[PDB]
């Protein structure tokens, strides 16, 4: 009936390890399934566990099974970008159906090499007078806060990885309908690095 997962949300730096738990009924236990569900991908099956005291491994990911006490530990060794996902545990009793826990959402913060924080203004490719502000190349200590102003739009940070040079970078975009708006004040509500480049 009830499958619990905790912590529900965890942040981990790339290269660091983490673990979390799943609790399920000991009565009528047949199997435990673990999945890694990455954003807009198929939930990936990691392993099925049936034997008490067992430990299974899939690469850097491992899990344990306690059928008596009704719990499992999931371990992530040396977290990598692809490990950013919701980890779902699901219990099978005699029937075909799986009963799911609410998941553990894992955010693996990237290792940013040589951070060079900067706020750039980009102009529309088309003949319009539109522009966007791009805050980029800041390390994982920086949080991008929302705009205090309703007419100022600020996205959350996302990490891209240029495979042509094995380079990773964070960025957030800001834009505003306001005629007086400027890229120099766009991210004012965020604690940004002291040395952030504001081109002239």
């Amino acid at each position: 009936l009830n499958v619990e997962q905790s912590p529900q949300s965890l942040h981990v730096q790339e290269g660091d390890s983490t673990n979390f738990t799943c609790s399920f009924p000991s009565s009528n236990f047949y199997a435990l399934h673990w999945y890694r569900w990455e954003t807009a991908k198929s939930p990936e099956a990691l392993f099925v566990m049936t034997l008490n005291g067992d430990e299974k491994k899939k690469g850097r990911i491992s899990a344990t099974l306690n059928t008596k006490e009704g719990y499992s530990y999931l371990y992530i060794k040396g977290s990598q970008p692809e490990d950013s996902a919701t980890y779902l545990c699901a219990f099978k009793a005699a029937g075909n159906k799986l009963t799911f826990g609410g998941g553990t959402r894992v955010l693996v913060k990237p290792n940013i090499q040589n951070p060079d924080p900067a706020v750039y203004q980009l102009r529309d490719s088309k003949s319009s007078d539109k522009s966007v502000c791009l805050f980029t190349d800041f390390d994982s200590q920086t949080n991008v806060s929302q705009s205090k102003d309703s007419d100022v739009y600020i996205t959350d940070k996302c990490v891209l990885d240029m495979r042509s040079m094995d380079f990773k970078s964070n960025s957030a975009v800001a834009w505003s309908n306001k005629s007086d708006f400027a890229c120099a004040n766009a991210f004012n509500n965020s604690i940004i690095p002291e040395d952030t480049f504001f081109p002239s």
Binding site: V3, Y30, A31, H33, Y35, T39, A40, K41, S42, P43, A45, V48, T50, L88, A90, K92, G95, N96, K97, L98, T99, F100, G101, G102, D116, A118, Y120, Q121, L122, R123, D124, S125, K126, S128, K130, S131, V132, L134, T136, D137, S150, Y153, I154, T155, D156, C158, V159, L160, D161, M162, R163, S164, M165, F167, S169, S171, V173, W175, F197, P199
Partner: protein
Amino acid sequence: PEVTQTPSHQVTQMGQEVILRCVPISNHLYFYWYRQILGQKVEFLVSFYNNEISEKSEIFDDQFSVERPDGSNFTLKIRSTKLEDSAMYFCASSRLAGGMDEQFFGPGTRLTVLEDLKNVFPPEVAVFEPSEAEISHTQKATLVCLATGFYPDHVELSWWVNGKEVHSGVCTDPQPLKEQPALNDSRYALSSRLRVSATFWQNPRNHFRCQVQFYGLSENDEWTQDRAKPVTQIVSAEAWGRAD
């Protein structure tokens, strides 16, 4: 081998019939449907084996039905959609139904059920060219795509370089933002970045494009408004590389 489902998203008006399609793993005998309402747990709907239902939940009411029309396809029908049917629908399959049998999941179909279709609008899409300051500072070049004014919120944004979809150097906001948070039918905005080397951007024959697959109305959907029917469609914007 993988379980497949198409489309990734579907929009329907409440009360209409929806058919969701799946391709189980070819040599699997057990097929399943699960759903997940946003912020809730993935929940069992039905399992199927040897041309008949195997097990079904309470959620699999009078409105639901399953079909196995041939040896390759597997379908879930929702006779009359409710607002509460908005969810990610997953199809799964397993070789057998033993304790050690893995249930392999498809990528899901996200179904959005709307009370009315009058507030449905496709996005505007614009491509923003890399800043010369970034090019000179980093020897890198970031393009920004902005999809705006669309409703509902579950679009698919992609980048196309020289007519080929790219994934390297891309990151898209995992969720759109509300242009008017205080409104319940607020239009949405979504952004993405594509970063390339300065040398690549400076080649005037490199062609960049941002494409947004919008999910909206179908041919069957009735439309009595003056504006263009907001059908499922692709909206794009482009930019060519620049030497100077």
